[PDB]
Paper text:
BoNTs are synthesized as a single polypeptide chain (150 kDa), which is post-translationally cleaved into a di-chain molecule composed of light chain (LC, 50 kDa) and heavy chain (HC, 100 kDa). LC is the catalytic domain and a zinc-endopeptidase, while HC is further divided into two sub-domains of equal molecular mass called the translocation domain (Hn) and the membrane binding domain (Hc). Inhibition of neurotransmission takes place by proteolysis of one of the SNARE proteins that mediate cell secretion. Synaptobrevin (or VAMP) was identified as the BoNT/D specific substrate and is cleaved at the Lys59-Leu60 position.
Despite the large unit cell, a single molecule was present in the asymmetric unit corresponding to an unusually high solvent content of 75%. No electron density was observed for regions 442–457 (between the two domains), residues 494–510, and the C-terminal poly-histidine tag (last fifteen residues), all in solvent-accessible areas. A PISA22 analysis shows that the LC-belt interaction is supported by over 40 potential hydrogen bonds and 2 salt bridges, making up a 3373 Å2 contact area. Loss of the zinc ion was confirmed with a local rearrangement of the active site residues. Overall, the role of the zinc ion appears mostly catalytic with little impact on the structural integrity of the light chain.
Author numbering: 1 to 441, 458 to 493, 511 to 871
The structure:
């Protein structure tokens, strides 16, 4: 059940078995053979930096070369000591992977899932053993030169990082002849590029599952989960079900609304993350991908039945060896003839296992760790951690070490409560910005790219339902014992591989010009300066922008109570008054006039963020009830959906009794359409709408955090100034009182989270759904009319007044099919709404 993980030092000498020098043509940064270590069967670790760029450099480039957060260090992984640390790092993470059954099953799949000895171009009767998609050259330095002695046929190679150490998508990038086999069943050996000590971060600001005692926190990812995600790319690549990067979500950027200048998100990324976000890809797309892979598996089955010859021509003895290997890998049956065959039950089982079970969110629940809730959650500055140190991180518990204070109720992934997690400065982390500016074409403002919501381009999703189509008569839609072995094989004389490499592209900041002082201005007004001296709260956004010593507040009552100070009273009488005013204000809720589909609203969002230029005019509550839910999505165009694909039939098709089959198909296909259209609506919602509403959660949490940071700054000011009898004696009471603000902020966020979640769900029901039903009604009307005429056209033929029977088929168009969540296809969506409503 468990594949053994071997220990190594970088020192250990080459032994023509599991420590070798390997030639990796794909690595443009390093062109010699490099030392590799087989930590378990067919899985090799290569402690070297990697790049696929022409003219690779490890240096910080002059402008950004991607839409991802970046960090550059040419020294990283240069010395033999650093390589030793990296090597042992990945051995340790692999032991951790074996600490649950899901990770044991993953590793087993990789080891026995070796890439097929051939692709589409290989003759059907042939195994080709000569291709770089299966082979890596083994080389020894003899007589002043490198020399190929052998090959290996690995499953995964694990490199250190790209120039951008924070990179997390380079393992998807397949060059040359590796792409196609990865999508056509055959599969390709996989090459990961990884830096496990560098950990990406996330928060629980928008989750109702955050700690009531500690409040909202920023956590780091467990490195084992990060590495398992990467190895899930290897899995899809090896089993030949990789989804090509042509299938992807793209960002919409526009004038007049704010969205993130974000990366593309491949369908592979959505699959390997898992959970609800997989529904951004409608079932019609997912079904095609499954059916495609099925086709290729059947095709690999037929190949194994007809194989006579080999390349090279010598290797004819090895046919049975590889017939076994691949027969086991794809899990074929034998029919009574003796031939290999795809069992459909077994294929669907394998396929769903590789695509649903093996995903990030499943992994993180199994290892009992904190993790990103949804795909488009906010990223923060990362951290660094020496994961070899058993005081910081262990095989059994990860960061949750009991004897250091960490446990289920006090996670070791928490970045502020774990002082072994070393934070990276924004100085060292390069990212894109959106510059925001007043009036034409006060100062301009910078907004970091990660603090903007991702909104997908709608054309990015799926266009199937919008295509006119013709319906016809034929239209529809036990284990093996882990055994470590010598992996050397005899050299096939491979032709050398020279790959072009990728061109580098540079990327600019975006400048956006805006008519008023919007949310981003209102948030900047709330900030403290680095080196605070003597602050006061102000009710005037322009003033706070003006002077470093004035910070904006959206609570007038708070301003007077803060600025007073301690006027010959006891310190805590003032402090408690301030905190009780803050607390009591941020817990306010107002019930609204009119019949809105949202119960209560949170009134201070208006003056906090100036939504709709609503501050000064002071009318957030009415404006929201007037405009309804879409009021919160500033500038975002009214939801629209184009005309659906019409259904039509053949002109003739007079001959045959399956003139009638066409009609049953059109009716069933009309049902499929209502379904596919709802699914398309949920994708828009998840990739375009929920992200913009959640952006208000994050913006509200920032402003509550600025108000709190200002209250604390003024408390510290006033405590140094204070000289009363009790000063020394109330010290802990003051510290504790300041710390209490995190819990108070957190409880306000329960209300804001719930309000935002309601707004979001009602946008789906009020602003999107009616437009979709409209269009399905035009599609109904049209398809019925076309069915009437098909009958009337084929009047003389087929029917002996079976014509009259076909009228009642058009009484099936009386009913609409309104959107219904208590329905097996909407289960995942139902689950997610239930839980944040509780």
């Amino acid at each position: 059940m468990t594949w053994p993980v071997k220990d190594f030092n970088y020192s250990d000498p080459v032994n023509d078995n599991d420590i070798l020098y390997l030639r990796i043509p794909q690595n443009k940064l390093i062109t010699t053979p490099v030392k590799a270590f087989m930590i378990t069967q067919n899985i090799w670790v290569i402690p070297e930096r990697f790049s696929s760029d022409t003219n690779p450099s490890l240096s910080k480039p002059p402008r950004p070369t991607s839409k991802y957060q970046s960090y550059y260090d040419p020294s990283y992984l240069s010395t033999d000591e650093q390589k030793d640390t990296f090597l042992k790092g990945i051995i340790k993470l692999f032991k951790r992977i074996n600490e649950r059954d899901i990770g044991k099953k993953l590793i087993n799949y990789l080891v026995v899932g070796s890439p097929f000895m051939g692709d589409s171009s290989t003759p059907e009767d042939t195994f080709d053993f000569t291709r770089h998609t299966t082979n890596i050259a083994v080389e020894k330095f003899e007589n002043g030169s490198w020399k190929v002695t052998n090959i290996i046929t690995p499953s995964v190679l694990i490199f250190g990082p790209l120039p951008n150490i924070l990179d997390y998508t380079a393992s998807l990038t397949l060059q040359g002849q590796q792409s196609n086999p990865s999508f056509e069943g055959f599969g390709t050996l996989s090459i990961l590029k990884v830096a496990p000590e560098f950990l990406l971060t996330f928060s629980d600001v928008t989750s109702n599952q955050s700690s009531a005692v500690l409040g909202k926190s920023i956590f780091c990812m467990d490195p084992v989960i990060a590495l398992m995600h990467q190895l899930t790319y290897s899995l899809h690549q090896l089993y030949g079900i990789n989804i090509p990067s042509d299938k992807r979500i793209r960002p919409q950027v526009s004038e007049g609304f704010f969205s993130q200048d974000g990366p593309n998100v491949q369908f592979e990324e959505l699959y390997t993350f898992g959970g609800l976000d997989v529904e951004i890809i409608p079932q019609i797309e997912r079904s095609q991908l499954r059916e495609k892979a099925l086709g290729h598996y059947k095709d690999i089955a037929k190949r194994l039945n007809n194989i006579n010859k080999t390349i090279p021509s010598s290797w004819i003895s090895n046919i049975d060896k590889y017939k076994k290997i691949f027969s086991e890998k794809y899990n074929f049956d034998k029919d009574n003839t003796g031939n290999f065959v795809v069992n459909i039950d077994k294929f669907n089982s394998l396929y769903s296992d590789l695509t649903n079970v093996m995903s990030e969110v499943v992994y993180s629940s199994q290892y009992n760790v904190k993790n990103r809730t949804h795909y488009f959650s906010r990223h923060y500055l990362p951290v660094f951690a020496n994961i070899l140190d058993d005081n910081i991180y262990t095989i059994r518990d990860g960061f949750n070490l009991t004897n250091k204070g960490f446990n289920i109720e006090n996670s070791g992934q928490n970045i502020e409560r774990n002082p072994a997690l070393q934070k990276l400065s924004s100085e060292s982390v390069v990212d894109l910005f959106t510059k925001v500016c007043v009036d034409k074409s006060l100062q301009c403002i910078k907004v970091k790219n990660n603090r903007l919501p991702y909104v997908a381009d709608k054309d990015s999703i799926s266009q199937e339902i919008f295509e006119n189509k013709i319906i016809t008569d034929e239209t529809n839609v036990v284990p093996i014992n882990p055994e470590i072995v010598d992996p050397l094989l005899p050299n096939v004389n491979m032709e050398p591989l020279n790959l072009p490499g990728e061109e580098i592209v540079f990327y600019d900041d975006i400048t956006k010009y805006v008519d008023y002082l919007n949310s981003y201005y209102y948030l900047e007004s709330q900030k403290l300066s680095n080196n605070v001296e003597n602050i006061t709260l102000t009710t005037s956004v322009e003033e706070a922008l003006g002077y470093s010593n004035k910070i904006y507040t959206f609570l007038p009552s708070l301003a007077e109570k803060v600025n007073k100070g301690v006027q010959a009273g006891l310190f805590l009488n003032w402090a408690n008054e301030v905190v009780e005013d803050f607390t009591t204000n941020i817990m306010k809720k107002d019930t609204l006039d009119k019949i809105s589909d949202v119960s209560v609203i949170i009134p201070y969002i208006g003056p906090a963020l100036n939504i709709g230029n609503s501050a000064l005019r002071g009318n957030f509550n009415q404006a929201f009830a007037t405009a309804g839910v879409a009021f919160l999505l500033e500038g975002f165009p009214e939801f629209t959906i184009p005309a659906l694909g019409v259904f039509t039939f053949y002109s003739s098709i007079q001959e045959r009794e399956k003139i009638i089959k066409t009609i049953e198909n059109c009716l069933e296909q009309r049902v499929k359409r209502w379904k596919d259209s709802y699914q398309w609506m949920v994708s828009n919602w998840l990739s375009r709408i929920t992200t913009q509403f959640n952006h208000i959660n994050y913006q509200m949490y920032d402003s509550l955090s600025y108000q709190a940071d200002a209250i604390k700054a003024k408390i510290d000011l006033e405590y140094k100034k204070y000289s009363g009898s009790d000063k020394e004696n109330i010290k802990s009471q003051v510290e504790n009182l300041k710390n209490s603000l995190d819990v108070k902020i957190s409880e306000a966020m329960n209300n804001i989270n719930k309000f935002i979640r309601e707004c979001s769900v009602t946008y789906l029901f009020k602003n999107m759904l009616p437009k979709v039903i409209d269009e399905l009604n035009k599609f109904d009307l049209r398809t019925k009319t076309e069915l009437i005429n098909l009958i009337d056209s084929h009047n003389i033929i087929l029917v002996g007044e079976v014509d009259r029977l076909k009228a009642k088929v058009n009484e099936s168009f009386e009913n609409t099919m309104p959107f219904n969540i208590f329905s097996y296809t909407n289960n995942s969506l139902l689950k997610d709404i239930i839980n944040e409503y509780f």
